[PDB]
Design a protein around this ligand. Structure first.
Ligand SMILES: CC1(C)CCN(Cc2ccc(NCC3(O)CCN(c4cc(NCc5ccccc5)ncn4)CC3)cn2)CC1
Lengths: 199, 248
């Protein structure tokens, strides 16, 4: 079901096996470097059930550049690309104890053998204006849609402004549960007949 | 404006549209120039060369092994070779490393290297290549690539116990078969004021620079002498950053 869908939840505790398989996963984790996750919590996330063949996009900063690579490999991905977002103001000028930081990093991992994706349409540098704090650039959704148009996607640690068509967004600041895909709805009521997500 | 869509539409990379790509404090550049040692350099086949011959121990090491991926349409070093370099044997206990890693598997294996030699990565410096002069030149992709690769990374590592510069270098993509890295990496390194024993491994005649010892297989001449070189840093000059006045 194409329109935006989302689940307010604690990603540590949701049973993600009910969501099915996805062509693309994106995560912008609250790395322990607010409502963050310990390194072990990140390692333990049940990312492997989310995909059979496809790509994962993992935002990283500071020492999560290394920890994110560890998680990526633990969950079964090879890192095959690394997008950087050059942060600009509205006039296209560029906005870490040794250098000032002009960019953010997004690791790109692959799992299995994805078929029918449009690899090489976009390049690996985003130039885009900073919006609010911790707000990733919307250009990433367009890059992912051109790479894999029409397919099902899932975002971890999203916020309300992140909900997108063809995406299911998970985060604990989303407004309730909004599911439209009948397969997901069916598995969700079976797994959560009272609409509560606990252990 | 979505510059990603625009790249799909026109082939102009998004970095083509970064601009400038009220204070000055370049008494430091002049101080670096005054403190710099004479350029020193040695032709040496690094695979066959006992790295321990290079003394004393270095404060900064810039490592630029010639990766195969640099020769798209063109002796390369693999990460197997690079990882087996004894770099910890020549690095000072407090010292820095700058490792050009390319844009592929080197972003991972270069991190393995840093840890193997005892460094922690403290910065990730991206050389972003514009194509203002050649919007219509598609990239022949790595088989594993998801995206067109338009940048290279130089990883900075520290071992032992911001300022003016940004972790980005923006230049036009060099002509085919030109393997040179932007000289701006030297300015960033020298602006840190890290000490005066500076080694560039896999440098070339074209990269020799005051303040640096350059060691590489393609150098045409050498002037390296270990005792002469050590004498640049003997007392009272042992601890200088390279950013302070010479001692009377
Ligand atoms: C591209 C960048 C510039 C973007 C920013 N990134 C870093 C970054 C990422 C994310 C955020 N914020 C977003 C969230 O708020 C979303 C919902 N969210 C949780 C958390 C949870 N479990 C743990 C838990 C739950 C309750 C209590 C304690 C722990 N489960 C479900 N959603 C916590 C994160 C802020 N900055 C840098 C690159």
């Amino acid at each position: 079901l194409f329109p935006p869908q989302w689940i307010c939840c604690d990603i540590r505790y949701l049973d993600v096996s009910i969501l099915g398989k996805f062509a693309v996963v994106m995560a912008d984790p609250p790395w322990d470097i607010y409502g963050t996750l310990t390194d072990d919590e990140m390692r333990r996330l049940n990312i492997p059930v989310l995909q059979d063949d496809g790509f994962l996009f993992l935002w990283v900063t500071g020492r999560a550049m290394e920890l994110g690579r560890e998680c990526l490999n633990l969950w079964g991905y090879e890192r095959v690309d690394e997008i950087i977002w050059v942060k600009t103001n509205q006039l296209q000028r560029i906005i870490g104890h040794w250098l000032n930081h002009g960019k953010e990093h997004c690791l790109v991992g692959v799992k299995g053998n994805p078929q029918g994706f449009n690899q090489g349409l976009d390049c690996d540098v985003i130039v885009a204006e900073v919006r609010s704090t911790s707000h990733k650039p919307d250009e990433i959704y367009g890059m992912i849609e051109r790479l894999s148009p029409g397919t099902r996607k899932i975002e971890l640690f999203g916020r309300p402004h992140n909900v997108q068509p063809n995406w299911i967004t998970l985060g604990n600041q989303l407004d309730g549960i909004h599911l439209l895909d009948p397969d997901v709805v069916a598995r969700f009521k079976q797994r959560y007949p009272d609409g509560i997500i606990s252990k | 404006n979505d510059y990603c869509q625009h790249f799909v539409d026109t082939g102009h990379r998004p970095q083509n549209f970064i601009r400038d790509v009220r204070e000055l404090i370049r008494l430091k550049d002049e101080l670096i120039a005054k403190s710099n040692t004479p350029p020193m350099y040695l032709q040496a086949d690094i695979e066959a060369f006992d790295i321990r011959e290079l003394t004393p121990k270095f404060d900064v090491i810039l490592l630029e092994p010639p990766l195969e991926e640099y020769y798209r349409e063109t002796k390369c070093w693999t990460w197997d070779d690079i990882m087996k370099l004894e770099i910890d044997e020549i690095a000072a206990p407090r010292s820095f490393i700058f490792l050009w890693c390319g844009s592929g598997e080197g972003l991972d294996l270069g991190r393995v290297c840093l840890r193997k030699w005892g460094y922690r990565r403290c910065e990730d410096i991206c050389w972003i290549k514009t194509n203002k002069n050649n919007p219509g030149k598609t990239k022949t992709l790595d088989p594993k690539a998801v995206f067109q690769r338009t940048k290279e990374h130089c990883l900075m590592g520290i071992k032992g116990t911001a300022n003016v510069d940004i972790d980005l270098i923006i230049t036009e993509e060099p002509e085919i078969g030109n393997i040179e890295k932007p000289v701006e990496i030297f300015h960033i390194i020298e602006h840190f004021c890290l000490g005066r024993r500076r080694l560039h491994l896999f440098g070339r005649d074209s990269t020799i620079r005051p303040g640096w010892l350059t060691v590489g297989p393609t150098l045409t001449n050498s002037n390296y002498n270990a005792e002469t070189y050590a004498s640049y840093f003997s007392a009272p000059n042992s601890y200088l950053t390279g950013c302070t006045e010479e001692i009377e």
